[PDB]
Enzyme design. Structure first.
Site, PDB file in Angstrom:
ATOM      1  N   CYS B 122     -42.765  21.377  -2.837  1.00 30.22           N
ATOM      2  CA  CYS B 122     -42.151  21.489  -4.148  1.00 30.22           C
ATOM      3  C   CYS B 122     -42.042  22.953  -4.621  1.00 30.22           C
ATOM      4  O   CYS B 122     -41.103  23.308  -5.347  1.00 30.22           O
ATOM      5  CB  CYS B 122     -42.947  20.643  -5.152  1.00 30.22           C
ATOM      6  SG  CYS B 122     -43.427  18.906  -4.664  1.00 30.22           S
ATOM      7  N   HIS B 258     -41.784  22.795 -12.363  1.00 30.89           N
ATOM      8  CA  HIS B 258     -41.402  21.742 -11.427  1.00 30.89           C
ATOM      9  C   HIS B 258     -41.369  20.400 -12.156  1.00 30.89           C
ATOM     10  O   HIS B 258     -42.281  20.060 -12.924  1.00 30.89           O
ATOM     11  CB  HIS B 258     -42.352  21.693 -10.226  1.00 30.89           C
ATOM     12  CG  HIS B 258     -42.022  20.618  -9.234  1.00 30.89           C
ATOM     13  ND1 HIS B 258     -40.926  20.684  -8.400  1.00 30.89           N
ATOM     14  CD2 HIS B 258     -42.656  19.462  -8.931  1.00 30.89           C
ATOM     15  CE1 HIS B 258     -40.890  19.605  -7.639  1.00 30.89           C
ATOM     16  NE2 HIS B 258     -41.928  18.848  -7.940  1.00 30.89           N
ATOM     17  N   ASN B 289     -37.910  13.809  -9.418  1.00 32.71           N
ATOM     18  CA  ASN B 289     -38.518  14.927  -8.721  1.00 32.71           C
ATOM     19  C   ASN B 289     -37.711  15.227  -7.472  1.00 32.71           C
ATOM     20  O   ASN B 289     -37.630  14.388  -6.574  1.00 32.71           O
ATOM     21  CB  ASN B 289     -39.955  14.567  -8.339  1.00 32.71           C
ATOM     22  CG  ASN B 289     -40.723  15.729  -7.736  1.00 32.71           C
ATOM     23  OD1 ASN B 289     -40.164  16.591  -7.065  1.00 32.71           O
ATOM     24  ND2 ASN B 289     -42.027  15.740  -7.964  1.00 32.71           N
TER      25      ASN B 289
HETATM   26  O1  LIG Z   1     -54.160  10.118 -13.160  1.00 30.68           O
HETATM   27  C1  LIG Z   1     -53.615  10.356 -14.259  1.00 30.68           C
HETATM   28  O2  LIG Z   1     -54.189  10.802 -15.270  1.00 30.68           O
HETATM   29  C2  LIG Z   1     -52.116  10.083 -14.383  1.00 30.68           C
HETATM   30  C3  LIG Z   1     -51.721   8.767 -13.706  1.00 30.68           C
HETATM   31  C4  LIG Z   1     -50.779   9.005 -12.526  1.00 30.68           C
HETATM   32  C5  LIG Z   1     -49.321   8.826 -12.965  1.00 30.68           C
HETATM   33  C6  LIG Z   1     -48.505   8.011 -11.949  1.00 30.68           C
HETATM   34  C7  LIG Z   1     -47.945   8.869 -10.798  1.00 30.68           C
HETATM   35  C8  LIG Z   1     -47.507  10.273 -11.241  1.00 30.68           C
HETATM   36  C9  LIG Z   1     -48.251  11.346 -10.443  1.00 30.68           C
HETATM   37  C10 LIG Z   1     -47.929  12.760 -10.931  1.00 30.68           C
HETATM   38  C11 LIG Z   1     -46.645  13.302 -10.298  1.00 30.68           C
HETATM   39  O3  LIG Z   1     -46.805  13.614  -8.895  1.00 30.68           O
HETATM   40  C12 LIG Z   1     -45.736  14.329  -8.414  1.00 30.68           C
HETATM   41  O4  LIG Z   1     -44.586  13.895  -8.519  1.00 30.68           O
HETATM   42  S1  LIG Z   1     -45.986  15.890  -7.626  1.00 30.68           S
HETATM   43  S1  LIG Z   2     -42.423  18.204  -3.073  1.00 28.28           S
HETATM   44  C1  LIG Z   2     -42.910  16.490  -2.633  1.00 28.28           C
HETATM   45  C2  LIG Z   2     -41.946  15.826  -1.649  1.00 28.28           C
HETATM   46  C3  LIG Z   2     -42.542  15.764  -0.242  1.00 28.28           C
HETATM   47  C4  LIG Z   2     -41.465  15.954   0.828  1.00 28.28           C
HETATM   48  C5  LIG Z   2     -41.828  15.249   2.142  1.00 28.28           C
HETATM   49  C6  LIG Z   2     -40.979  14.002   2.402  1.00 28.28           C
HETATM   50  C7  LIG Z   2     -41.786  12.944   3.160  1.00 28.28           C
HETATM   51  C8  LIG Z   2     -41.287  12.757   4.591  1.00 28.28           C
HETATM   52  C9  LIG Z   2     -41.709  11.391   5.133  1.00 28.28           C
HETATM   53  C10 LIG Z   2     -40.758  10.902   6.232  1.00 28.28           C
END
Ligand SMILES: O=C(O)CCCCCCCCCCOC(=O)S
Ligand SMILES: *SCCCCCCCCCC
Ligand SMILES: O=C(O)CCCCCCCCCCOC(=O)S
Ligand SMILES: *SCCCCCCCCCC
Lengths: 334, 334
Positions: B122, B258, B289
């Site tokens: 990312c 991001h 994302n």
């Molecule tokens: O654990 C917490 O306090 C939050 C709960 C997780 C939220 C559900 C998934 C989102 C994870 C954050 C984003 O990860 C990425 O995209 S990098």
């Molecule tokens: S920046 C988070 C996205 C991760 C990119 C990797 C994609 C996963 C490949 C699995 C086949």
């Protein structure tokens, strides 16, 4: 009305040291000739390769890269605490994510340091050495790791009469940092994306992942195209690199072309009109073509055999996949 | 005893333009709520995402990056012949070799300009922006394209329930070159390799290739761990970024972190102590994302809505896989 500040690093940077690691398993030509209709002699005269190294099943591009770094660091008289960033150049980190650079930093003892994976085919070192030098002079870092690593074995089609005897394994890292005298000339680079399919992964991972029980991907090579391009186009690439450093053909002491094919390198050495006594890297003999790792693996070999001295003026020319090259005049490390 | 040329390039470098590209297929939250029983509200409350864009089958990271560059060039009122290099940052170029960059280069009609692919999850774009700037100030190139591209679509497990709704496709390219004003700050970057497994491909391609009767790989996310890490560690990073660019938090006009998760970026805003009226990138709503592509896509959106003006002082913070991060204070382009 507030101008963004700019920082600044060192004027002169250089290769402080090189470290190299080859996996202990020696694969002969005769062992390669097992599922091939050719001999040791055919392979050695057409390529210059005698034996090469294959890694272990548990080993990876990253683990070898970690290993190459330690040794360079050790050769540099440096600790992981003295490093500000790490660039891994590879074409065989078999994960889309995460990148290998963090993992390598992590196992080295410096988990927090900046870094990335830079992938540009065989020419990956020239670009990553170039990126370090510029970043260090830029002030984003003082001392940096640039590691070339490649696990090519698992990508080789052992029935492929044109390329099986070519690609191999290894990892060699350099330490770049400030030096009294200027040590790394300007990067000279470019490409030929027209010929992108000259060296390629034949099938893409996603397409393969939709029908896994169909043919798997392998590395493919349209060799004559690569011979012609490399043999005839890198001469200028070398001349441009020497010109930007303010040096002459007859001033090069060590010549380190990519270890792709010894006949290609023979033509370049003659095309580059170097001194009749210019030391010319021949690590191809017992390393084979290790892509991103090829040149720093070649550098180490010559320093270890004592054919090159540390501080020798040297020309680097990377060439290969994507159809992309990178070249710089450097002092020899260690 | 021969000297190596000490060369210089332009000191002041900025973002001339930004050019984005987005897949026409609009995939919704309730459309992602057909396989796996969640809710469009649940996703929106927890992530801030309403819809996302999935690319077509004949489309790729490589292809989408090319079109973003077409547009980046178009918005800077420039030509491929004016460009000396491209950096394709990505995590979804589904080939080990050849690199995307030279392909992207040839398709724009930029015959054989330098170029490589940069991988650092990312945060790849922050790393790429910093590398290009370094290269121009060193004199290795004059004007350059930097393109975050991504096709995360085919990497998503529809049974995820932890990240099927998170990832999406797109590309966005910036043109980087000389300016009278210093436009790109010093690169603040770093990683945490101990936590490399937080965002990962769960099976490596070779292992999978070796065993087609087993499961295929997918993108995996350790949400809670990524949330903890990005939302409490990234404040300091921005603080380090602004310190290097010589700006006070209250001088920032735009904040482009991001686009991982709105709730993360929400906590960032408060810790960062910016102005009440400071523009916060929310592209995530209809983009999701997009790893490498995120920030420049998030930039383009703010310029398209007029929420951000050209010349505005922006704070960029890239973070994610490798557990790697990248940040710098920039001037908005276009
Ligand atoms: O654990 C917490 O306090 C939050 C709960 C997780 C939220 C559900 C998934 C989102 C994870 C954050 C984003 O990860 C990425 O995209 S990098
Ligand atoms: S920046 C988070 C996205 C991760 C990119 C990797 C994609 C996963 C490949 C699995 C086949
Ligand atoms: O003449 C034939 O039929 C076969 C001869 C092939 C051997 C010559 C080596 C192949 C050239 C590959 C060079 O490119 C790289 O090393 S990459
Ligand atoms: S010149 C660099 C060659 C790199 C080859 C790696 C691609 C292997 C194909 C994967 C099956």
């Amino acid at each position: 009305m507030t101008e963004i500040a700019t920082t600044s690093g060192a004027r002169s940077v250089g290769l402080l040291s090189v470290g190299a690691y080859r996996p202990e398993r020696v694969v002969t030509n005769d062992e390669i000739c097992q599922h091939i209709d050719s001999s040791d002699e055919w392979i050695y005269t057409r390529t210059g390769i005698k034996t090469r190294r294959f890694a272990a099943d548990d080993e990876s591009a990253a683990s070898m890269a970690t290993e190459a770094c330690r040794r360079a660091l050790s050769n540099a008289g440096l600790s992981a605490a003295d490093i500000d960033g790490v660039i891994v150049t590879t074409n065989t980190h078999f994960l889309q994510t995460p990148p290998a650079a963090p993992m390598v930093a992590a196992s080295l003892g410096a988990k927090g340091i900046l870094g990335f994976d830079l992938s540009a085919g065989c020419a990956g070192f020239g670009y990553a050495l170039g990126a370090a030098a510029d970043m260090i002079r830029g002030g984003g870092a003082a001392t940096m790791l640039v590691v070339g690593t490649e696990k090519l074995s698992p990508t080789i089609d052992m029935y492929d009469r044109g390329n099986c005897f070519i690609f191999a394994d290894g990892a060699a890292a350099v330490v770049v940092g400030e030096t009294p005298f200027q040590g790394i000339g300007p990067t000279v680079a470019g490409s030929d994306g027209e010929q992108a399919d000259a060296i390629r992964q034949d099938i893409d991972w996603i397409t393969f992942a939709q029908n896994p029980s169909g043919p798997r991907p392998f590395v493919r090579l349209e060799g004559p195209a690569v011979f012609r391009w490399a043999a005839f186009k890198m001469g200028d690439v070398g001349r441009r690199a020497m010109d930007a450093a303010g040096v002459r053909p007859d001033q090069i002491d060590v010549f380190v072309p990519h270890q792709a094919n010894s006949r290609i390198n023979e033509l370049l050495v003659k095309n580059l009109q170097l001194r009749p006594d210019a030391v010319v890297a021949n690590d191809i003999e017992h390393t084979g073509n290790t892509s991103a790792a090829s040149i720093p693996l070649a550098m180490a070999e010559l320093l270890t055999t004592g054919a090159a001295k540390p501080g020798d003026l040297a020309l680097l020319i990377g060439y290969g996949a994507g159809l992309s090259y990178a070249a710089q005049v450097v002092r020899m490390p260690k």
